[PDB]
C-alpha cells in the first residue's frame, strides 16, 4: 500500500517525465487527485514498456526478413539461376498480384490450400461482423421509449409537486 | 514443431491461421490495450452501481 | 467445421509432407553427388594406380 | 417475419452454393497431398538404390 | 464514492482537470504516447520496405517448386520432363515461361473459386480481376474491421443512456414519494 | 507483453507456457466481458424495477 507521501513522490516524479519542457499547473493537494493519476501512470508505463516491446520486435523482424530475403535469393541463384528480373512483363505482373494479394491477406504460405480457408474466412468475417449488431438497435428502442416516458413523467411529476404545493 | 507452435499461439490469440506470424505482438499487446479498454468500463459498471 | 477439420487435417501435414519430399530427394542425390565426386577421386588415384 | 425467412433462405442458398466449392476444394486439397506422398517414393528411392 | 471520474469530481478540481487535459496529446484513446505510435509507425515502415521484397522472393521460389512438382505428377503421366535433370540452359528457358504459366494457373484456379460471378469468367476480366483483387481483399478487412472498431462507442452509448435513465428513475421516485408522503400522507 | 508487469522472466520458458499465457489473456478478456454483459443486465433489472 503506497502511501500518499510516495504516490505524490511518484507523481512529481511522473511529471517531468511526461511535461518535459513543459510547464506543470499546480494541483490541489487532495488525496483524490493524487489517487486517480496514480492509476493512469501505473498502466502507461505498462503499455510504453509493451510498446516498446512491439517496436523493437518490428525492427528486429524487419531485419530478419532482409536476412531471409538475401538467403532465399542466394539460394534461387545457386540452385535455378533465377532472379525477378527474369520473368516478362506478364509475369512479374503475376507475381506482382500474388505478392499484393498476400499483402492483403497479411498471410505467410502461398500455397492455394493456405489461400482456400483464409479466403474462405475472409468472405465469411466481413458478414460476421456486422451480424450480431441488430440486436443493440432493436434493444435501444424499449430504452428510448421507457426513458422518454420517464423524462415526460419527471417534467409532469415536477408540476405536479408544485399543483400539490399550491393544493 | 515451433511452426505448430506459433500457429496454435495464432489461434489462442485470435489470429486466423496461417497469417502473419510476425503481427503476432502488436495484435495480442492491442488484445491488452482492449483489455485496459474493458476492466475500467466495469468499473463504470460497478462503482455507480 | 466437422469437414473444415477434415481438410485441415491435410493442411496442417500437406507443408510437412512436401518438406520431407524436399529434404529427403536432397539428402538423395547428394549420395549421388558424393558417388561422382569419389569417382573423380577414384580415377584421379586409379591412373597413377 | 417473411423477409427474415428469405434472407436465411438465401444464406442457406449461398451456403450449399460454397459447400459443393468447398467439396471441390478438399478434392484438390486430397489430390495435391497425394500428389506429395507420391513425390516423397523418388526420395525413398534415390535414398536406396542410389 | 465515485472512484471512477465524475463531473462531481471533474468540478471538485478544475486544476486536476486542465492537468488530464494536457494528457490528451501525449495519452491518447488506446493510452500510447503519440511519438510512441509514430516510432512503431516508422518501425512497421521497415517492416513493410522489407516484406515487399521478401514477399517478392518469396513466390518466386514457391512456384518454381509447384511447377517442379507439377512435373513430377507429369513424369508419371506419359510426356516425361526428364530433360530438366539432364539440361540445365533449356530447363531454364522452359523454367521462366513455366513459372509464369503455373502463376497463370495459380491466378485463373484461385479465381475460379473466390467468386461464382468469377467462375465463368473470360481470360482478360479474370486478369484485371487478379490484378484488382488485392484492393477488394482491403476494402473486404477494412469493411469488416469497421464494425468490431465502431461497436465500442455504441456500447458506451447504451450504458451511459442506461445510467441516465437509473438518474431519471432516481428524480421521479424522490418526486413521487414527495407527492405521497409529504404532500397526501401527513398533510392532507 | 503477454504476461506484463505481474510476473518476470521464468528460468525456463516454453512455447507451451506462452500458450497457457495466450489463454489466459483470452480468458481474461472473455470473464471481463461477460461480467460487463452480466453487470448491465443486472442494471437493467434494476432499472425495471425502478
Same mark, same amino acid.
Given at each position: 500500500?503506497?502511501? %500518499?507521501?510516495?504516490?505524490?513522490?511518484?507523481?512529481?516524479?511522473?511529471?517531468?517525465?511526461?511535461?518535459?519542457?513543459?510547464?506543470?499547473?499546480?494541483?490541489?493537494? !487532495?488525496?483524490?487527485?493524487?489517487?486517480?493519476?496514480?492509476?493512469?501512470?501505473?498502466?502507461?508505463?505498462?503499455?510504453?514498456?509493451?510498446?516498446?516491446?512491439?517496436?523493437?520486435?518490428?525492427? %528486429?523482424?524487419?531485419?530478419?526478413?532482409?536476412?531471409?530475403?538475401?538467403?532465399?535469393?542466394?539460394?534461387?541463384?545457386?540452385?535455378?539461376?533465377?532472379?525477378?528480373? !527474369?520473368?516478362?512483363?506478364?509475369?512479374?505482373?503475376?507475381? !506482382?498480384?500474388?505478392?499484393?494479394?498476400?499483402?492483403?491477406?497479411?498471410?505467410?504460405?502461398?500455397?492455394?490450400?493456405?489461400?482456400?480457408?483464409?479466403?474462405?474466412?475472409?468472405?465469411?468475417?466481413?458478414?460476421?461482423?456486422?451480424?450480431?449488431?441488430?440486436?443493440?438497435?432493436?434493444?435501444?428502442?424499449?430504452?428510448?421509449? !421507457?426513458?422518454?416516458?420517464?423524462?415526460?413523467?419527471?417534467?409532469?411529476?415536477?408540476?405536479?409537486?408544485?399543483?400539490?404545493?399550491?393544493? | 514443431?515451433?511452426?505448430?507452435?506459433?500457429?496454435?499461439?495464432?489461434?489462442?490469440?485470435?489470429?486466423?491461421?496461417?497469417?502473419?506470424?510476425?503481427?503476432?505482438?502488436?495484435?495480442?499487446?492491442?488484445?491488452?490495450?482492449?483489455? /485496459? /479498454?474493458?476492466?475500467?468500463?466495469?468499473?463504470?459498471?460497478?462503482?455507480?452501481? | 467445421?466437422?469437414?473444415?477439420?477434415?481438410?485441415?487435417?491435410?493442411?496442417?501435414?500437406?507443408?510437412?509432407?512436401?518438406?520431407?519430399?524436399?529434404?529427403?530427394?536432397?539428402?538423395?542425390?547428394?549420395?549421388?553427388?558424393?558417388?561422382?565426386?569419389?569417382?573423380?577421386?577414384?580415377?584421379?588415384?586409379?591412373?597413377?594406380? | 417475419?417473411?423477409?427474415?425467412?428469405?434472407?436465411?433462405?438465401?444464406?442457406?442458398?449461398?451456403?450449399?452454393?460454397?459447400?459443393?466449392?468447398?467439396?471441390?476444394?478438399?478434392?484438390?486439397?486430397?489430390?495435391?497431398?497425394?500428389?506429395?506422398?507420391?513425390?516423397?517414393?523418388?526420395?525413398?528411392?534415390?535414398?536406396?538404390?542410389? | 464514492?465515485?472512484?471512477?471520474?465524475?463531473?462531481?469530481?471533474?468540478?471538485?478540481?478544475?486544476?486536476?482537470?486542465?492537468?488530464?487535459?494536457?494528457?490528451?496529446?501525449?495519452?491518447?484513446?488506446?493510452?500510447?504516447?503519440?511519438?510512441?505510435?509514430?516510432?512503431?509507425?516508422?518501425?512497421?515502415?521497415?517492416?513493410?520496405?522489407?516484406?515487399? @521484397?521478401?514477399?517478392?522472393?518469396?513466390?518466386?521460389? +514457391?512456384?518454381?517448386?509447384?511447377?517442379?512438382?507439377?512435373?513430377?505428377?507429369?513424369?508419371?503421366?506419359?510426356?516425361?520432363?526428364?530433360?530438366?535433370?539432364?539440361?540445365?540452359?533449356?530447363? +531454364?528457358? +522452359?523454367?521462366?515461361?513455366?513459372?509464369?504459366?503455373?502463376?497463370?494457373?495459380?491466378?485463373? @484456379?484461385?479465381?475460379?473459386?473466390?467468386?461464382?460471378?468469377?467462375?465463368?469468367?473470360?481470360?482478360?476480366?479474370?486478369?484485371?480481376?487478379?490484378?484488382?483483387?488485392?484492393?477488394?481483399?482491403?476494402?473486404?478487412?477494412?469493411?469488416?474491421?469497421?464494425?468490431?472498431?465502431?461497436?465500442?462507442?455504441?456500447?458506451?452509448?447504451?450504458?451511459?443512456?442506461?445510467?441516465?435513465?437509473?438518474?431519471?428513475?432516481?428524480?421521479?421516485?424522490?418526486?413521487?414519494? +414527495?407527492?405521497?408522503?409529504?404532500?397526501?400522507?401527513?398533510?392532507? | 507483453?503477454?504476461?506484463?508487469?505481474?510476473?518476470?522472466?521464468?528460468?525456463?520458458?516454453?512455447?507451451?507456457?506462452?500458450?497457457?499465457?495466450?489463454?489466459?489473456?483470452?480468458?481474461?478478456?472473455?470473464?471481463?466481458?461477460?461480467?460487463?454483459?452480466?453487470?448491465?443486465?443486472?442494471?437493467?433489472?434494476?432499472?425495471?424495477?425502478?
Amino acid at each position: 500500500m503506497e502511501p %500518499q507521501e510516495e504516490r505524490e513522490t511518484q507523481v512529481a516524479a511522473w511529471l517531468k517525465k511526461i511535461f518535459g519542457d513543459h510547464p506543470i499547473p499546480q494541483y490541489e493537494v !487532495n488525496p483524490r487527485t493524487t489517487e486517480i493519476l496514480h492509476h493512469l501512470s501505473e498502466r502507461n508505463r505498462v503499455r510504453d514498456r509493451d510498446v516498446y516491446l512491439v517496436i523493437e520486435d518490428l525492427k %528486429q523482424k524487419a531485419s530478419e526478413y532482409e536476412s531471409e530475403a538475401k538467403y532465399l535469393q542466394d539460394l534461387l541463384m545457386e540452385s535455378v539461376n533465377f532472379s525477378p528480373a !527474369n520473368l516478362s512483363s506478364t509475369g512479374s505482373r503475376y507475381l !506482382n498480384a500474388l505478392v499484393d494479394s498476400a499483402v492483403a491477406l497479411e498471410t505467410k504460405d502461398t500455397s492455394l490450400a493456405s489461400f482456400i480457408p483464409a479466403v474462405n474466412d475472409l468472405t465469411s468475417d466481413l458478414f460476421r461482423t456486422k451480424s450480431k449488431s441488430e440486436e443493440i438497435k432493436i434493444e435501444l428502442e424499449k430504452l428510448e421509449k !421507457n426513458l422518454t416516458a420517464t423524462l415526460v413523467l419527471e417534467k409532469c411529476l415536477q408540476e405536479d409537486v408544485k399543483k400539490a404545493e399550491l393544493h | 514443431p515451433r511452426g505448430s507452435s506459433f500457429i496454435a499461439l495464432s489461434h489462442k490469440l485470435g489470429l486466423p491461421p496461417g497469417k502473419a506470424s510476425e503481427l503476432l505482438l502488436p495484435a495480442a499487446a492491442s488484445l491488452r490495450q482492449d483489455l /485496459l /479498454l474493458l476492466q475500467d468500463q466495469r468499473s463504470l459498471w460497478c462503482w455507480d452501481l | 467445421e466437422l469437414m473444415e477439420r477434415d481438410t485441415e487435417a491435410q493442411d496442417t501435414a500437406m507443408e510437412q509432407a512436401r518438406q520431407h519430399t524436399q529434404d529427403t530427394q536432397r539428402r538423395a542425390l547428394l549420395l549421388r553427388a558424393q558417388a561422382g565426386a569419389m569417382r573423380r577421386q577414384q580415377h584421379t588415384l586409379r591412373d597413377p594406380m | 417475419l417473411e423477409d427474415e425467412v428469405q434472407t436465411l433462405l438465401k444464406l442457406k442458398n449461398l451456403k450449399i452454393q460454397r459447400r459443393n466449392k468447398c467439396q471441390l476444394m478438399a478434392s484438390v486439397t486430397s489430390h495435391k497431398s497425394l500428389r506429395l506422398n507420391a513425390k516423397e517414393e523418388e526420395a525413398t528411392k534415390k535414398l536406396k538404390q542410389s | 464514492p465515485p472512484c471512477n471520474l465524475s463531473k462531481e469530481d471533474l468540478l471538485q478540481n478544475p486544476y486536476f482537470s486542465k492537468l488530464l487535459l494536457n494528457l490528451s496529446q501525449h495519452v491518447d484513446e488506446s493510452g500510447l504516447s503519440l511519438t510512441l505510435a509514430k516510432e512503431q509507425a516508422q518501425a512497421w515502415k521497415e517492416v513493410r520496405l522489407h516484406k515487399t @521484397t521478401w514477399l517478392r522472393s518469396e513466390i518466386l521460389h +514457391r512456384v518454381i517448386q509447384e511447377l517442379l512438382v507439377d512435373y513430377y505428377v507429369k513424369i508419371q503421366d506419359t510426356n516425361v520432363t526428364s530433360e530438366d535433370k539432364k539440361d540445365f540452359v533449356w530447363m +531454364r528457358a +522452359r523454367l521462366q515461361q513455366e513459372v509464369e504459366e503455373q502463376l497463370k494457373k495459380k491466378c485463373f @484456379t484461385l479465381l475460379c473459386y473466390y467468386d461464382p460471378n468469377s467462375d465463368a469468367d473470360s481470360e482478360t476480366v479474370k486478369a484485371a480481376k487478379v490484378w484488382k483483387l488485392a484492393e477488394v481483399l482491403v476494402g473486404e478487412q477494412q469493411q469488416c474491421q469497421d464494425a468490431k472498431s465502431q461497436q465500442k462507442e455504441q456500447m458506451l452509448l447504451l450504458e451511459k443512456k442506461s445510467a441516465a435513465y437509473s438518474q431519471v428513475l432516481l428524480r421521479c421516485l424522490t418526486l413521487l414519494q +414527495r407527492l405521497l408522503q409529504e404532500h397526501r400522507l401527513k398533510t392532507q | 507483453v503477454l504476461e506484463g508487469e505481474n510476473k518476470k522472466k521464468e528460468l525456463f520458458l516454453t512455447h507451451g507456457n506462452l500458450e497457457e499465457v495466450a489463454e489466459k489473456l483470452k480468458q481474461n478478456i472473455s470473464l471481463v466481458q461477460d461480467q460487463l454483459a452480466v453487470s448491465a443486465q443486472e442494471h437493467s433489472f434494476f432499472l425495471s424495477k425502478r
